[model samples]
Target: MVNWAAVVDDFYQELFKAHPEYQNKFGFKGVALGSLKGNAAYKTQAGKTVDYINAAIGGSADAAGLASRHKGRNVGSAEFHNAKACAAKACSAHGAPDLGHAIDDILSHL
Candidate 1:
């Protein structure tokens, strides 16, 4: 119901815009968000992102798992907070302020 496919598009588009220098951090940058969605591989990842966030916000999943996953990527507290910031920004831009709080609540663990 959230139309998360659209959200993920705007999510990475904004995220990439926020941090173009941190390209490899995403494992694949694709010159920004367009190529990401262009490949369709990243499309699957985008779907996965929204689904996981849905589950996490629904209490079926938790941030501890994400914390662990991000640890493998060497994601520091700074980036964790930045993602939270970016998520907040994205939700507001997408007209979902309520959604941002929920994401920050779960994202709090990381």
Candidate 2:
């Protein structure tokens, strides 16, 4: 089985690597790498992502709820797709290409 926690960690690492500018969206002024380690907002966001994915895998997630949360934040589908791509890439890099594709399939339907 894939180590989902590690995969999630890698997802954020790559997401920031590819779009360092997004750190500000998470409440960081600049690059969030070093400072993100102990930051509450970052940790909370990461935990939320993990929870969402796990819930989806377990068939207990409500995509509409997730969508509503994003909508309230003014987040668009483009940003959602981009983040999904990052997650897929992370899973592939972590030796779970099937899981990577699975994530894409799940999010696409969402």
Strongest candidate by lDDT: 2
lDDT of 1 by residue, 1-110 (tens): 66667776777777678877655665565555567767655767788888877786687766677667876787756775666677777777777644555556545666
What RMSD does model 1 have?
A: 2.3
Best by TM-score: 1
For candidate 2, write residues 1-110 as lDDT tens digits: 66777787888887788877666666654645866757777778878887877777788877767776666766756666777778888888888643444445545545
Model 1 stretches with alpha carbons more than 4 Å out: 98-108
lDDT of each: 0.68, 0.70
Per-candidate TM vs. native? 0.79, 0.76
Model 2 clash pairs are none
List the candidate 2 regions with Cα displacement exceeding 4 Å.
28-31, 97-110
